[PDB]
Ligand binder design. Structure first.
Ligand code: CL
Ligand code: MG
Length: 238
């Protein structure tokens, strides 16, 4: 009965490293690489890129269209409104919130988290793997109901809350049907999001050890563990 949507927020004018989603990455762009990885999700048919109406994000729309996913163009700084508009537009009941600085997101982890959410319908309204952090940065996945998002839209007036969506949930967990999803070990010391040039260099080194874009998260950590010099956004100690 429930429609799951993977709603990826991305924009060219990002606060950190503006333009990064359009950087060359493998045979595509940073954002295009992410979309190709999400094509392997069992929920791939309802992927939408949520970006702004500013002219610069014609590039974001272009990248999404090249990858055959839908595009929603809305509020630049009110992400609650952008996600609520998109979810209503596409009749989404369960929102999988991703951001375009996570190009190596693993669709198998996403699918497991959605499966857990759906199996507990009515006992969970918010599932995250990035409150407590045991995955590398850049695997961040948050899942919540349209109903929860509507409660946040009604409750939250602060600009920080409107821009980041989840902060009120994270600081008031006992007010929600809140649950967390762990990694099997603590990989939080690894940073696999793109906010700096050093992140980019690290991520470029990562994908060079795999022949396709279908590699899993655990494959990636094992390659980093075997080739510690992949990590260029953090000092390496032997
Ligand atoms: Cl954005
Ligand atoms: Mg980010």
């Amino acid at each position: 009965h429930m429609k799951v949507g993977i709603l990826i927020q991305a924009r060219m004018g990002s606060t950190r490293l503006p333009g990064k989603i359009a950087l060359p990455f493998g045979d595509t762009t940073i954002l295009g690489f992410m979309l190709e990885r999400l094509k392997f999700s069992k929920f791939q048919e309802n992927v939408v890129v949520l970006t702004t109406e500013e002219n610069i994000d014609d590039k974001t729309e272009e990248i999404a269209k090249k990858n055959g996913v839908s595009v929603f163009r809305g509020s630049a700084n009110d992400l609650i409104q952008r996600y609520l508009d998109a979810a209503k537009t596409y009749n989404i009941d369960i929102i999988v919130r991703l951001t375009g600085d996570c190009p190596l997101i693993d669709s198998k982890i996403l699918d497991l988290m959605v499966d857990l959410f759906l199996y507990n319908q009515g006992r969970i309204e918010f599932l995250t793997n990035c409150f407590q952090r045991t995955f590398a940065r850049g695997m961040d996945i948050e899942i919540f109901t349209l109903s929860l998002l509507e409660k946040l839209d009604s409750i939250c007036r602060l600009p920080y809350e409107r821009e980041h969506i989840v902060p009120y949930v994270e600081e008031n967990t006992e007010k929600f049907k809140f649950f967390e999803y762990p990694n099997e070990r603590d990989d939080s010391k690894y940073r696999l999001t793109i906010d700096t040039i050093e992140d980019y260099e690290t991520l470029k080194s990562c994908i060079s050890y795999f022949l396709s874009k279908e590699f899993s998260y655990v494959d990636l950590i094992e390659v980093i563990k075997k080739n510690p010099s992949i990590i260029q956004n953090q000092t390496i100690y032997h």
